[PDB]
């Protein structure tokens, strides 16, 4: 009979990079979604498959909460049926996605003068991701036909490139932290109600 800890997902001052987007399970708890939609300070709050009011009295068996940091223009790629450097290479949502996508500006938290080079993004990958598939490989992207032997050079590139966030960057390139919720149902008894 515990409340679901959405806050320690939201109050975390270290979100992981988008290539190693971070997964927390929310279960065995009654859920208070009412503090989320009533915040009204997000720059992006979409729900996909369920109305935000109706989901409070709705029972689920497991809630997965993805959380990561992307760029401002790349918030549009977190949606079922999008492409780009984030949807193909970093974080792919399924087409039958049943969760809510939450995003807020964090130019102030996550940028600093001289560039916050801590947040990385996989700029190259051979094949595109499955839904919810994580690629944390630092293996050299063979851009050509010559094998690389794991060094950099001609047609041999490192995949994890770094976002350089300054606070003077424009609104399209300010670091918008994103927390993607995901809801599921099984034959198991529902652990997440509200």
């Amino acid at each position, epitope marked *: 009979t515990n409340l679901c800890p959405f806050g320690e997902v939201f109050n975390a001052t270290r979100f992981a990079s988008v290539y190693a987007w971070n997964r927390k399970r929310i279960s065995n708890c009654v859920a208070d979604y009412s503090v989320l939609y009533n915040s009204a300070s997000f720059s992006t709050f979409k729900c996909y498959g369920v109305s935000p009011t109706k989901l409070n009295d709705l029972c689920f068996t497991n809630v997965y909460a993805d959380s990561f940091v992307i760029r401002g223009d790349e918030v549009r790629q977190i949606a079922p049926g999008q492409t780009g450097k984030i949807a193909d290479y970093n974080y792919k949502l399924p087409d039958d996605f049943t969760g809510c996508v939450i995003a807020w500006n964090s130019n102030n938290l996550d940028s600093k003068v001289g560039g916050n*080079y801590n947040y990385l993004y996989r700029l190259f990958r051979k094949s595109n991701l499955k839904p919810f598939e994580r690629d944390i*490989s*630092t*293996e050299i992207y063979q851009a050509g036909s010559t094998p690389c032997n794991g*060094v950099e050079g001609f047609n041999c590139y490192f995949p994890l490139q770094s976002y350089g966030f300054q606070p003077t960057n424009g609104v399209g390139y300010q670091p918008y932290r994103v927390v993607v919720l995901s809801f599921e149902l099984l034959h198991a008894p529902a652990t997440v109600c509200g």
Partner: antibody
Amino acid sequence: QLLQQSGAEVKKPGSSVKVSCKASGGTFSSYAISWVRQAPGQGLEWMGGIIPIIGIANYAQKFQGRVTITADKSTSTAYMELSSLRSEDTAVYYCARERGYSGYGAAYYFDYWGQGTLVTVSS
Amino acid sequence: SVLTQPPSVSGAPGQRVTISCTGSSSNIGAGYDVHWYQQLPGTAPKLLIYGNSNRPSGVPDRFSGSKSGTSASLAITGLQAEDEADYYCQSYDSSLSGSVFGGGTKLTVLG
């Protein structure tokens, strides 16, 4: 052919250990090289890690502020400059590598661990 | 160590023993994959079970891992004298932003 790592150490509290980790072999300047600790007779503990083609350094919240992990890709050697801990710092310090398979889930190391530097702090 | 794992197990050579790695909702239960490690005494530890159910190059087929929700199982079949070792489960953790290990099980064969 596996990995190179500096020999055993005995230190005083307040001094500092810079234990090296030479590319025991394989790819280096393109792989996350971590550091894992083991207190003698105790369980393993991750310490930190770098991706020595950039210079990013993650650390555990326990070992934060004291350890600094760096590498020079010209010499293919990592470093683990621990600042000082008093008496429970005595532990064998392996030097794991990091592959990072794609899919679901996360880091397994390589199998490449160093032979084990036992840095003992004592008076 | 965050990943709860028993102190030790004990079995017979030829028997089957199973080593539990129970985590939390942030480390194992959150879909991250466990990794099992073999430490022979006085040796540098090595890769045992790869990627939650897989194997690296050079391990017998007696070791196999699995995962069911907020748990894991290091399935060891047909215990041996060279299986007396310490077994550490590694599963990455979400809230810590770091790869946490397990409690370690000393495998003791009898006879």
